From TrEMBL, chains A, E, F:
InterPro entries: CHP02241 (IPR011747), Phage_T4_Gp19 (IPR010667). Pfam families: Phage_T4_gp19. It comes from Photorhabdus asymbiotica subsp. asymbiotica (strain ATCC 43949 / 3105-77) (Xenorhabdus luminescens (strain 2)). Transmembrane segments: none annotated. This is Conserved hypothetical phage tail region protein.
From TrEMBL, chain B:
Gene3D superfamilies: 3.40.50.11780. Signal peptide: none annotated. Residues 242-348 form the Tail sheath protein C-terminal domain. It comes from the Bacteria. It comes from Photorhabdus asymbiotica subsp. asymbiotica (strain ATCC 43949 / 3105-77) (Xenorhabdus luminescens (strain 2)). Residues 103-240 form the Tail sheath protein subtilisin-like domain. It holds the Pfam family Phage_sheath_1C. This is Phage tail sheath protein. Belongs to the myoviridae tail sheath protein family.
Length: 148, 352, 175, 175, 148, 148
């Protein structure tokens, strides 16, 4: 006999309900991938036997967002088309696990200074029953995870 | 106890022990109660339906009482409802009560009353205690001299002890519950031995196998002894009669139980006309009962005509003279199963 | 609340521990020790707030302290049964006062109390323990009373009483 | 600290050796020999500073010296369990006092104590060693008490006790 | 000549008389199915010949309750309609074999933390003489069987 | 002696009398099938022993309506013939159990955004005494059941 407010505190969070917000816009995405912290390890070892292991230089964060093609809207493409030589508008991406008809966040990830590389066009295919989907890849720094 | 004014719930905290109830059709004991017992009166039996029923009659469970620790050990092993008769008026109340089968001495001297009420006709079986002192293999035939040689009695030697009981528990009170627990799970024809005691019991005196060989032979004292894989357990099925007819308590208690059930079927034939249509209804009522008992495995016989026989008749059992007096004579025979008591292993060193 | 209880569970069920569907809450929070005073003699049922249930009704007792009519489910069951028996005795009105009428009056009541017992309204494991109906010229009415025009039936019922107190005993050692 | 302990680890965990999150420190530094005086009879728990932990709580004992209710995790577990059992017996209020109610009262408690035992709240390797629930007409309540309206349940629990002293023995020779 | 109190002790129990109680409510059901324990088996086997068989991981309990459609009442549907994202009210189901006009239980099964999946609507059918019935399916844990 | 207004409150509802209404039209159907809710279950299980069961992602609703072939009318076919590439007119289907000569509904199911797949033609058969029947299959979302 678990109460419905006990499940909100004790139970794990399902992945499939999430909100992605790219800068000021919020746009519906099919899937989000990557988005993990990582560290190189520095190892010193000298002759008397002691072995030092340290966290080292952080690694660059690479995120992949996947989204279907909608008939009026290309604002994933216009972001990657605006790249002149090294100047692009970087913007913050927030992923947020929500409840059904999300008025309440459960977890929140924050990405800083994300800019697009490698927008992937759909694979046109005459014998396929799929939607035209696009992956955009983002390079960024500082994934942080926020409670609620 | 508890006073209830508002509807609510009540979260009183008290340590009281509760035992689950059991209904036993075949074993209704009567606990002999000593005088200087202020709770029960002379000359009436107090039917105690459950341990909670007993715990309403007395206020507190008393560790020092011989009656208290014997009744709690009786209900923990699976005993049904019992009667409480004081020991000096005991010979007047047991003939009044109809369905009493067992007579249990909870540490009482009932040797006077057992001789006068245990008869071949009456259905009373009487389990009582062994001697409280730690006995010997040496002075062993003097301890069997203290008990009568009646076939209706069984003696269980070691007075059991428990962690809740301050004093030692008489072993006959735990065996009234073992009798009720055996007959419910496997039948009256099964012996009550090698059955573990459900309560927190263990014998006061550990008994060697060579000592049990002395007491098992002549006026047999069954013994409760501890096995490391079984715990404490009962290890005897023999009565106080050494004759080969009534040697074992499953055979004596089967015949006590069968003749009580035949008593109830002959109750409807009472004050009916004494002619042949009654006698063929008396025989048919017994023949149904012994057949369904044989089908349960109670009577030993491969062929159904080997297990029992019933005989009523004007040429056979009763005279024309006896019919006019009002008598009706039936002959019933049974073939009980005997328990395997000794198992002999022969170990051979070469395999062939 | 009386109409909502009897539709969902029956007249024989007490109307207590039922939440109030409207936006209600008691004006005065009532301690448990105060409710013990008023529940005994001329009983005042009380509506008090529980944190898991909201506001709820917490009494089933009438103003009579006698053990016959202590609870409102027993009094309202007998009021409801005798109104339904009133309607079955409406067809027997102005019929001839003889035995073929009385065995139709008894059969009409015996159908009703049986189907009420099958719903769980009357408390009895055996059907003959829950109710009894008795009509007769030797039994209930005199030859004198038959000529006056009277017809006398005896009905008995066995209602279910509600569990009002629950006593928990918590023991520190498990055995 | 009571609310912070029970949310992170449970009511059965003692509230001691937990650091104080606010900017707190004791007014009087307390020697270990002084705490040995007060811990025994009518026990005064003490908040004292450790150089690696900061300020921290260092007691779990109640004011009762008896071995049943010596520690505040055992007393607060029994207070919490019987409040949750209070809510499960709220639905049994004013239901018919017969056997189908009692086997629903026992089943509701047996679910709760099992899921509490699965959390590690009750101490027992076997599930039948941690708790027991007993309702019945032969067992707990008389036929007399059923007609009065009472319903009696027996619950037992086996709480976990906290390790309070740790004794180190340092030996000079290794063998 | 079997007495009527001997049949209460010796004879098997017929299935058709039972009480189902979902949470605080008790509701009449047409049939109950599933409701069985199960265990995976773990088998170790090494080279010298000995073969170990063990009970393993328990399996999830899946129950199917069947009930006819009544004109005022949908409280099997309102239970399954209240599922927001992973939050549902779980409640305990008890089945209990009873006697005629049940004032006495003979056996009792208890199900913990049951929540609904897959409510099945009736099959409307113009050439059928049947009642509108509904199956609800419950996923739960810990079926235990209680004597009386 | 059950009164006729007691049967309207207490008795179960027979399936064979129902009204199907496809969009603005109402058309007589021989049988309706499917039309049930369902949920996937998410199970988390960690090492200390606790096992979380959750309702998960909802399943798509698939309905099958069956109807005989009438000589002037093909408006089940014209609905499925109007499918150009992904554009079809979706419409709401309501099933409703009624009384005899239905002026009064007893139960009501509502289906949202139903569109046709798989119209099934009759099986012409020279040795059969049957009517030409057609099944249309509908994919939809959100079956809800309404009282009266």
């Amino acid at each position: 006999s678990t109460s419905t407010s006990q499940i909100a505190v004790e139970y794990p969070i399902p992945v499939y309900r999430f909100i992605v917000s790219v800068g000021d816009e919020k746009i519906p995405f099919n899937s989000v991938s990557g988005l993990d912290i990582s560290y190189d390890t520095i190892e010193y070892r000298d002759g008397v036997g002691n072995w030092f292991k340290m966290p080292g230089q952080s690694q660059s964060t690479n995120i992949t967002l996947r989204k279907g093609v909608f008939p009026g809207k290309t604002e994933l493409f216009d972001w990657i088309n605006s790249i002149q030589l090294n100047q692009v508008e970087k913007k913050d991406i927030t992923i947020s696990l929500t409840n059904d008809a999300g008025t309440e966040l459960l977890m929140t990830w924050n990405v800083s200074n994300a800019f697009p590389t490698s927008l992937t066009s759909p694979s046109f295919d005459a014998t396929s029953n799929d939607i035209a989907v696009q992956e955009i890849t983002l390079m960024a720094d500082r994934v942080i995870m926020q409670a609620v | 106890t508890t006073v209830t004014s508002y509807p609510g719930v009540y979260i009183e905290e008290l340590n009281s022990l509760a035992l689950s109830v059991s209904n036993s059709a075949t074993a209704v004991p009567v606990f002999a109660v000593d005088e200087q017992n202020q709770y029960i009166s002379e000359d009436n039996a107090i039917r105690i339906n459950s341990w909670m029923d007993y715990l309403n009659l007395i206020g507190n469970f008393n560790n020092e009482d011989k009656l208290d620790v014997s009744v709690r050990a009786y209900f923990a092993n699976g005993g049904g409802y019992c009667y409480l008769v004081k020991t000096t008026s005991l010979e007047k109340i047991i003939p009044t009560l109809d369905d009493v089968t067992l007579l249990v001495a909870a540490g009482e001297d009932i040797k006077t009353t057992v001789d006068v009420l245990c008869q071949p006709g009456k259905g009373l079986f009487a389990v009582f205690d062994g001697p409280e002192t730690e006995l010997t293999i040496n002075g062993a035939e003097e301890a069997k001299q203290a008990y009568t040689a009646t076939p209706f009695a069984a003696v269980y030697y070691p007075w059991l002890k428990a962690d809740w009981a301050n004093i030692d528990i008489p072993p006959s009170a735990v065996m009234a519950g073992v009798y009720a627990s055996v007959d419910l799970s496997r039948g009256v024809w099964k012996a009550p031995a090698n059955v573990a005691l459900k309560g927190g019991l263990e014998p006061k005196f550990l008994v060697t196998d060579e000592l049990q060989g002395e007491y098992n032979t002549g006026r047999a004292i069954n013994m409760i002894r501890n096995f490391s894989n079984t715990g404490t357990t009962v290890w005897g099925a023999r009565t106080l009669e050494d004759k080969d007819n009534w040697r074992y308590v499953p055979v004596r208690r089967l015949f006590n139980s069968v003749e009580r059930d035949i008593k109830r079927a002959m109750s409807f034939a009472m004050f009916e006309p004494n002619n042949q249509p009654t006698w063929e209804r008396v025989r048919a009522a017994i023949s149904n009962y012994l057949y369904s008992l044989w089908q349960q495995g109670g009577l030993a016989g491969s062929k159904e005509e080997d297990a029992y026989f019933v005989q009523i008749g004007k040429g056979i059992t009763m005279t024309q003279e006896q019919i006019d007096a009002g008598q009706m004579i039936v002959k019933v025979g049974l073939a009980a199963v005997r328990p395997a008591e000794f198992i002999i292993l022969q170990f051979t060193q070469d395999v062939e």
